[PDB]
Amino acid sequence: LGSILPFNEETADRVSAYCEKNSHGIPDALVEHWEWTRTRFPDADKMSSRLQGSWMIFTARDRKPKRILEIGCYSGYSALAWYEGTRDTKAEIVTLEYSPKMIAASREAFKKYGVGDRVKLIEGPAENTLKTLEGEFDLIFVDANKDGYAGYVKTILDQGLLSANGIILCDNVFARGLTIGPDCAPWLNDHVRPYWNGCGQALDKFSAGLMEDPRIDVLLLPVFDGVTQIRWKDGAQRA
């Protein structure tokens, strides 16, 4: 017997709303941006939920990372969440994006909310830009093209972009269920099914790939749309 509660769609949404009601909310400015994004780019099926926003903020407040990297800025929603949760450390927040339209939206939003002091938007395909980064990050949020996750994590590990005390959080690992199997998301809108099916195939390869890497500890948590947590294994204790 497993670790996941079975809910139908309606009930899952009610439990989601209950979580939002009984968790501290995201700031008003972030709600403003969230509603703006959803309206301006309708049914894109891309931005994180309000509760995920709360989770991001809580996580940064808790962990107090010195530097944050995220891959896949979109409209800047998660970037703003990381910003909110790191006001005390004034962490640098590096975010990568390739879409010209979403770059413009994110720059506009970053200017509106005055977060330019430590949010740095790096433009271009992350396959090109990620490897150009220097130093290390205490928290890395991977939330871009699902077919690219393996390549991104590989660069992150091989170039030491993940700090000794850090964590990588990879989003949407379940691909709505389709990472696990073709029959695991019967509720899914058929119009997005082939997209998520392709993502699931890549993410299944990704997930199996991580289990072969002796350098890291790995946990796939069944929360939201699946979140893989990655850290370096403990350093050598004795000579």
Ligand X SMILES: C[S@@+](CC[C@H](N)C(=O)[O-])C[C@H]1O[C@@H](n2cnc3c(N)ncnc32)[C@H](O)[C@@H]1O
Interface residues with its own copies (CB under 8 A) are 1-9, 11-24, 38, 47, 49-52, 54-55, 58, 61-62, 64, 88, 165, 167, 174, 176-177, 179-181, 183-185, 187, 207-208, 210-211, 217-225, 228-229, 231, 234, 237
Q: Answer with the entry of its own copies, ligand X, none that 12 interacts with (C-beta below 5 to 8 A by kind).
A: its own copies
Number of other residues whose CB lies within 10 A of the CB of residue 15:
11
Residue 84 annotated as binding site:
no
Cβ proximity to ligand X: between 1 and 236 the closer is 1
DSSP letter (8 states) at residue 223? S
CB of 235 to ligand X, least distance (A): 29
First to last CA, the chain: 43
Strands 162-170 and 227-232: antiparallel
**How many whole angstroms separate alpha carbon 154 and alpha carbon 44?**
28
Indicate whether 123 belongs to the interface with ligand X (CB under 6 A).
no
Give every CB contact of residue 201 below 8 A, 6+ residues apart in sequence: 179
**Which position's Cβ is nearest ligand X?**
72
Produce one character per residue of 101-136: b if its CB has 16 or more CB atoms within 10 Å, e if not. Answer: ebbebbbebbeebebeebbebbeeebeebbeebeeb
Selected range binding ligand X among 114-122, 124-132, 189-197, 207-215, rule: CB under 6 A = 124-132
Residue 23 assigned as binding residue? no
Binder among 46, 107, 118, 231 for ligand X (CB under 6 A): 46
Asked if 206 and 218 count as a contact pair (C-beta separation under 8 A), the reply is: no
Nearest-angstrom CA–CA distance, 95 and 78? 9
81 and 51 in contact (C-beta within 8 Å)?
no
User: Among its own copies, ligand X, none, what does residue 102 contact (CB within 5–8 Å per kind)?
Assistant: ligand X
Q: Does 127 bind ligand X (CB under 6 A)?
A: yes
Report whether 126 belongs to an annotated binding site.
yes
Residue 229 interacting partner from its own copies, ligand X, none (CB closer than 5 to 8 Å by kind): its own copies
Residue-wise burial string across 182-198, b where 16 or more C-beta atoms lie within 10 A, e elsewhere: eeebeebeeeeeeebbe
Residue nearer to its own copies on the CB measure, 45 or 158 = 45
Give which of ligand X, its own copies, none residue 127 binds (C-beta under 5 to 8 Å, depending on kind): ligand X
> Which residues lie near ligand X (CB under 6 A)?
46-48, 72-74, 77-78, 96-99, 102, 125-127, 143-145, 148
